[PDB]
Amino acid sequence: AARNAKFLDAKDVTNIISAFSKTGINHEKLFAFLSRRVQTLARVGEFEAAHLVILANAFSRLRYRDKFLFGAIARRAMSLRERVTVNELVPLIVAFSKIGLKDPKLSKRFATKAMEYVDQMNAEQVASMFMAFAYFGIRYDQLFGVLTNRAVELIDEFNAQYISTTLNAFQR
Amino acid sequence: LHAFVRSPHYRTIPSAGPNGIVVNRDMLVHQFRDFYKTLQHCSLVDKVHLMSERPSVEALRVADQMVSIGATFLEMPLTGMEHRATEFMESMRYVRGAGGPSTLASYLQDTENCRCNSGDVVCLPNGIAVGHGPRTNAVAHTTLKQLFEVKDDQFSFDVFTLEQEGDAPPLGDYFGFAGSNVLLTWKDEHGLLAVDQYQQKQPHTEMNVVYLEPGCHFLSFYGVDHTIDVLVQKGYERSMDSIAAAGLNPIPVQWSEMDKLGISMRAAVLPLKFFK
Amino acid sequence: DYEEADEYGDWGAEPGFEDRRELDFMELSPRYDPLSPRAFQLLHSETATDVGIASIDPSKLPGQSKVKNALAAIHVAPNDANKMRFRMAFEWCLMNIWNMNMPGELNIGAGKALYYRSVAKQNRNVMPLWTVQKHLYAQHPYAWFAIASESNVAAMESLAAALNMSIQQERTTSYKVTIRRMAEFFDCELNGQLKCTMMNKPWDRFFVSHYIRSKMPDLRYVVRARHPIKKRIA
RNA sequence: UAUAUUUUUUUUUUUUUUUUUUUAAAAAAAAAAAAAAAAAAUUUUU
Ligand SMILES: *O[C@H]1[C@@H](O)[C@H](n2cnc3c(N)ncnc32)O[C@@H]1COP(=O)(O)OP(=O)(O)OP(=O)(O)O
């Protein structure tokens, strides 16, 4: 794969990255080549709103950080306005927060998008994105307030398994 | 149905191309992405693949290497193109990435002495057209006569050797062809000569002809599929009306700066047919 | 996020074992690159993960009255195991460098190999040598520092008298420079008269071994070679 | 001697210094800094 990370399309690249994420290898040259190729492909829109989640999750779990790649992925997700649903938005936030050693002005824009996706989401993504925003380290008074306002309706759906995360994020 | 293009190099792109007019480096990059979007929407090509970056700007000509006439391919002869042969190697990879090697034009590349250029050979319904001029020899026409020729009531295929002057551009540049018996031609001396030469051959073709003002770059492909669309430069307005009056939908694209560079529609993309 | 049981190899018999090249004592992963160790081998003096075997006479034992030799597992001194691993790596390095036929050099440096805090995966303290070896060979969260003292100079002069050292060069002042470039890197040693008399590439780290002692003085064994270059450009 | 990028073209606001004019105060210009903003720049022979 290392010598063939250049001659691939989008689907092959995302499939190969997803396959290599789970194994646990840390070949640096392969990851650099695939990051370049992803950056080159993301210049002109060539990723549907289903492979960005896979790429971000695989890179975040792989424990590899790059400002340029994540910026390009965020920009491409930003271009496809109204196409990404909440069910396809929360995992991106989780993946970006798992590598939370980042800079502001990125979670700032993600706060704006989260405003209109609070209505049609259940308690699981509520707690998960709440922990993610807590790990971002930026005080979002209005976002936290609206999350608190909307969270009380689905208090019945709380299975008490993920109550620990939403309780611990406040302490965080 | 497979189309290949190459992104330009921003650092080594030269201003003031070989016509005495300066160019804007940023404007090329700005226009290339819109060209990509138009190409991938214009429904003339099934797939578009983005080739990697290379330093030489003369490498932006993805074509002039390898021509698709049918299920098989034909590589171009190595004559004066050795200085960039290396990058040619890379191109093939992308082709083989999603396609087979076909015949590798062993019969064409190794044909003793060869002088061929992508654009001298243009396909047509039950026909092939070779622009015999300062770029193509008669040996190539004889080889195509040997290879791509069949003659019967239903196995009907023909080859037309078209004469042109020394100063004429390559055949596929000016006079092209679009599906459903529509033939596009420049309204200059070269186009009139080509139309007359075609008319003297096979009078039973019944091919309607539409004229365009000279100096217009357009892309149109026969293809296994049938489609009514053409790609035209967003310059001369009268050509759009002239071609739309015949029932063909035109699509405008901007190529001012790349025209000053000297890059045509034929060499901007690489059409290919991939089968199983 | 926001094997360990099998690390000791106890919960079964890993199928397809022992059918691999003898690279147990070193970490080898599959061209010129500076600051890129091609073979890492961590070592220690107090702790050594190697057991030994020895012969015995079991004739007394009730039932083994017909066998004269029987092997038993005995622990071994760490220094002998360290020496065995060192020579096992050294023969491999010698064969490799002979096959490549590069100009061979060997360095034994004195200094401290100070590591970084991020080495400890899982934020644990006690871990087997294997895992720390893999972590060092993969992430490289370490840095080498060379330092000595002036007060021992006369002392090691006694070592000279102990080892009949002979002076081949006195105190010399040299201006080391790193003549970098946009494509490759190079180095030079300006003399007192200030001219460039050598032109060469940076050293290629082919094998690194850290011998850590209990106290301050630690040892670093390095095998490095220099790739050839046409003298025209030089 | 196992932490690679640094950033950049251009618009808005604020602060500091200098020259000029007028009545300690106001305005234009030059230089510097800070904040913000639109937009752009990476480097493999199986
Ligand atoms: O060990 C290195 C290092 O301490 C220092 N050095 C060289 N190049 C360096 C860069 N780019 N960054 C930081 N430090 C650097 O100098 C030595 C190089 O070797 P040196 O001490 O001069 O002598 P030695 O290894 O015995 O033999 P050389 O041929 O390498 O000089």
Short mmCIF file of N, CA and C (backbone and C1' of nucleotides) and ligand atoms in Angstrom, two decimals, chain C residues 35 107 144 146 176-178 180 185 187 189 201-203 205 220 224 226, chain D residues 1-2, ligand 1:
data_model
loop_
_atom_site.label_atom_id
_atom_site.label_comp_id
_atom_site.label_asym_id
_atom_site.label_seq_id
_atom_site.Cartn_x
_atom_site.Cartn_y
_atom_site.Cartn_z
N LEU C 35 18.83 9.92 11.08
CA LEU C 35 18.08 9.83 12.33
C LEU C 35 17.02 8.73 12.28
N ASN C 107 31.13 2.88 16.63
CA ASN C 107 31.29 3.89 17.66
C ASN C 107 30.77 3.36 18.99
N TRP C 144 19.40 10.94 22.90
CA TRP C 144 20.71 10.60 23.42
C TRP C 144 21.49 11.86 23.76
N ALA C 146 25.37 13.13 25.23
CA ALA C 146 26.75 12.79 25.53
C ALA C 146 27.33 13.83 26.47
N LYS C 176 33.02 22.53 13.17
CA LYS C 176 32.05 21.63 12.56
C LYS C 176 30.87 22.44 12.03
N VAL C 177 30.47 22.16 10.79
CA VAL C 177 29.35 22.83 10.16
C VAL C 177 28.48 21.80 9.46
N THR C 178 27.19 22.09 9.39
CA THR C 178 26.21 21.26 8.69
C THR C 178 25.77 22.02 7.45
N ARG C 180 23.65 22.17 4.84
CA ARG C 180 22.40 21.61 4.37
C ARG C 180 22.09 22.11 2.96
N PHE C 185 21.43 16.66 2.45
CA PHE C 185 22.17 17.28 3.53
C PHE C 185 23.64 16.88 3.43
N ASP C 187 27.82 17.76 5.43
CA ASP C 187 28.54 18.26 6.59
C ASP C 187 29.97 18.59 6.20
N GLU C 189 34.03 20.10 8.03
CA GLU C 189 34.88 20.39 9.19
C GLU C 189 35.90 21.45 8.79
N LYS C 201 28.35 13.02 3.04
CA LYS C 201 26.97 12.93 3.48
C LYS C 201 26.90 12.71 4.99
N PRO C 202 25.76 12.98 5.61
CA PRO C 202 25.61 12.65 7.03
C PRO C 202 25.63 11.15 7.25
N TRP C 203 25.96 10.77 8.48
CA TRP C 203 26.08 9.36 8.82
C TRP C 203 24.73 8.66 8.74
N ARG C 205 22.55 5.82 10.33
CA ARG C 205 22.41 5.01 11.54
C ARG C 205 21.86 3.65 11.15
N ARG C 220 26.53 3.64 24.61
CA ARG C 220 25.78 3.54 23.36
C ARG C 220 26.67 2.94 22.29
N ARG C 224 27.47 2.50 11.94
CA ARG C 224 27.04 3.44 10.92
C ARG C 224 27.95 3.33 9.71
N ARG C 226 28.57 5.13 5.44
CA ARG C 226 28.39 6.29 4.58
C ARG C 226 28.14 5.83 3.15
P U D 1 25.69 11.89 16.97
"O5'" U D 1 24.43 11.71 17.92
"C5'" U D 1 23.10 11.96 17.43
"C4'" U D 1 22.43 13.02 18.27
"C3'" U D 1 20.91 13.06 18.17
"O3'" U D 1 20.35 12.29 19.23
"C1'" U D 1 21.78 15.15 17.55
P A D 2 19.41 11.04 18.91
"O5'" A D 2 18.16 11.70 18.17
"C5'" A D 2 17.08 10.89 17.70
"C4'" A D 2 15.91 11.74 17.25
"C3'" A D 2 14.71 11.74 18.20
"O3'" A D 2 14.07 13.02 18.13
"C1'" A D 2 14.05 10.91 16.09
O1 LIG E 1 26.34 13.25 17.49
C1 LIG E 1 26.24 14.42 16.69
C2 LIG E 1 25.58 15.57 17.41
O2 LIG E 1 25.90 15.58 18.79
C3 LIG E 1 26.15 16.78 16.71
N1 LIG E 1 25.29 17.06 15.55
C4 LIG E 1 25.61 16.82 14.26
N2 LIG E 1 24.59 17.19 13.44
C5 LIG E 1 23.61 17.67 14.20
C6 LIG E 1 22.26 18.23 13.97
N3 LIG E 1 21.76 18.34 12.72
N4 LIG E 1 21.55 18.62 15.05
C7 LIG E 1 22.03 18.51 16.30
N5 LIG E 1 23.25 18.01 16.58
C8 LIG E 1 24.07 17.58 15.59
O3 LIG E 1 27.46 16.41 16.29
C9 LIG E 1 27.61 14.99 16.34
C10 LIG E 1 28.14 14.46 15.01
O4 LIG E 1 29.32 13.70 15.24
P1 LIG E 1 30.59 14.30 16.03
O5 LIG E 1 30.27 14.35 17.50
O6 LIG E 1 31.02 15.55 15.31
O7 LIG E 1 31.77 13.23 15.84
P2 LIG E 1 31.53 11.65 15.59
O8 LIG E 1 30.07 11.32 15.74
O9 LIG E 1 32.55 10.90 16.41
O10 LIG E 1 31.94 11.49 14.05
P3 LIG E 1 31.31 12.43 12.90
O11 LIG E 1 31.93 11.90 11.63
O12 LIG E 1 29.83 12.20 13.02
O13 LIG E 1 31.76 13.83 13.25
#
